[PDB]
Design a protein around this ligand. Structure first.
Ligand SMILES: *[C@@](O)(CO)[C@H](C[C@H]1CCNC1=O)NC(=O)[C@@H](CC(C)C)NC(=O)c1cc2c(OC)cccc2[nH]1
Ligand SMILES: *[C@@](O)(CO)[C@H](C[C@H]1CCNC1=O)NC(=O)[C@H](CC(C)C)NC(=O)c1cc2c(OC)cccc2[nH]1
Lengths: 305, 303
């Protein structure tokens, strides 16, 4: 037993980190088959990043302007193109460590592992949740751009995040592997602010199911609710509304505990309206919202890859 | 910026994880060169684990009694010895993925990465600290025995932990890679208690510095304290004493923030005496003690 934030084993992604350099600008890229993916702003000088015209800056660059390195080994760039905010560089070598992979665009509330990475060298791995305001509460220093976030299902690596930006508030913002930002952010050297954040309701419920699985069920009440009623109430507390997908992915935990989703919602609603009354759940006075239902399953029942 | 519980990348260790089965008992082993290390209770039956006379059980075993699977390949055991609670199985094949490694014994309050692992397949990675009562607060389910903890310095993996046990309180116990338990625990099937768990003071102070580096300052105050008077109050709260070394290891964090160590101690003393009201620090409602000063430096230098 025990309940912790847990990243996926990172070896399959470590074998795909490389360093990409233009001029003196360096960052991380993701080497899959014979293509390297990285943030397009690598083509910018410091002064270019203030107000960049990426189409114009790229028109002046050739394959031979791009330094791609696995460790100290150079991979010759033989083609380049821009997709949204990500640069794609065809290299002359197929990465022999390429895992089975997909590119996915995750939803707010979903979690992923971030492989922290500097100059193409992995440095750490940790778990993150996409906040409803499309930031992540990460740990990123200078040179971290291009670091990726991923999930592993079976033996397939699902890439969902590539790092670009730190906001003034100290949270982080980035794109999917197709170069589309999560949230209303742009890759300019400017101070940008995220929408007001909210609590990830589906994850709080997951966490309550986790508590119940562990015999901690004082908070189960006698009421139920409609989904619409619950959503209208939850927004009054800065909680995200539930989708039908959210109800669906709570199913297994609902079946395992025998507690219908809408019953657990009525239980959570009472907690919001009346507070914890000095009690804890799983040892915490805070309701935790960065464990998805899959995370609860991974840690309460055990899953391998 | 930002501060997060972070484990080392696990690839170098994943390549060493294998599965070891004896009879009806299966757990994880660590494959380095031509040796696979695993917990020795893999040789016990249900009846045996109650009170195993391990040397007796071990001698009655043959090489072929041990099934070692590395992925889709089975490894041929050509020998077997025992070092304390760790069984050493010789195999006819060197692990080609063997990294540069050493076996170290970690000290209380130090952190390491755990590669959670089932049936020789890794399931996740997270960071832990060796607590002063020599338990760790982990996440370990059935078939997790043999999972290892480690640190990576440059390209050398320092193995420091192999998992054996979950105490009735839900915390976890294990050995170094020479088979010596951390703490007063024994690999028999009995309910075992640990000594009273104290709080790792130098780590709580480091985490408070991290909170300051990241914009959280509500807990600071104008007061200072002497080392001794801080230790008087801390021990009253079951916090480990702070040593002059500890003060010294915190120097870099004091420099960066401009808050003297004994000033941070005055803040911590007030937090202990007053609690946190309804406030949080780095998103936590509890004083965190599983981040070392180096964990904090490596994540907040330059911020
Ligand atoms: C290993 O996987 C066994 O090979 C496992 C560790 C996990 C089980 C679930 N959580 C874990 O961390 N260890 C054990 O199952 C054994 C270890 C001994 C050395 C054989 N048991 C315990 O850790 C255990 C026994 C026991 C008990 O026995 C009567 C009473 C209370 C608590 C308790 N823990
Ligand atoms: C990448 O490593 C750069 O390639 C870097 C991320 C790092 C920096 C430290 N923390 C991180 O997460 N990204 C940036 O520096 C981007 C670069 C492009 C223009 C997208 N910019 C920012 O992160 C950025 C600019 C800011 C600004 O404008 C002056 C004001 C306030 C915050 C801010 N952040």
């Amino acid at each position: 037993s025990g309940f912790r934030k847990m990243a996926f084993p990172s070896g399959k992604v470590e074998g795909c980190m490389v360093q990409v350099t233009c001029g003196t600008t360096t960052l991380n890229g993701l080497w899959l088959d014979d293509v390297v993916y990285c943030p397009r702003h690598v083509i910018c000088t410091s002064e270019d990043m203030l107000n960049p015209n990426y189409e114009d800056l790229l028109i002046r660059k050739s394959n031979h302007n791009f330094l791609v390195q696995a460790g100290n080994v150079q991979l010759r760039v033989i083609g380049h193109s821009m997709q949204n905010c990500v640069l794609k560089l065809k290299v002359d070598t197929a990465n022999p460590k390429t895992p089975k992979y997909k590119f996915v665009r995750i939803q707010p509330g979903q979690t992923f592992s971030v492989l922290a990475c500097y100059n193409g060298s992995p440095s750490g791995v940790y778990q993150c949740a996409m906040r409803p305001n499309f930031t992540i509460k990460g740990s990123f220093l200078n040179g971290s751009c291009g670091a990726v976030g991923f999930n592993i299902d079976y033996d397939c690596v699902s890439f969902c995040y590539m790092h670009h930006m730190e906001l003034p508030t100290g949270v982080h913002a980035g794109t999917d592997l197709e170069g589309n930002f999560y949230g209303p952010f742009v890759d300019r050297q400017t101070a940008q602010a995220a929408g007001t954040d909210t609590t990830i309701t589906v994850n709080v419920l997951a966490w309550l199911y986790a508590a119940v699985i562990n015999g901690d069920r004082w908070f189960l009440n006698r009421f139920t609710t409609t989904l619409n009623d619950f959503n209208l109430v939850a927004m009054k507390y800065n909680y995200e509304p539930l989708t039908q997908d959210h109800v669906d992915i709570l199913g297994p935990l609902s079946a395992q505990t025998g507690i219908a989703v809408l019953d657990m919602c009525a239980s959570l609603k009472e907690l919001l309206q009346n507070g914890m009354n000095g009690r804890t759940i799983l040892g915490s006075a805070l309701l935790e919202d960065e464990f998805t239902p899959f995370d609860v399953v991974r840690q309460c029942s055990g899953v391998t890859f």
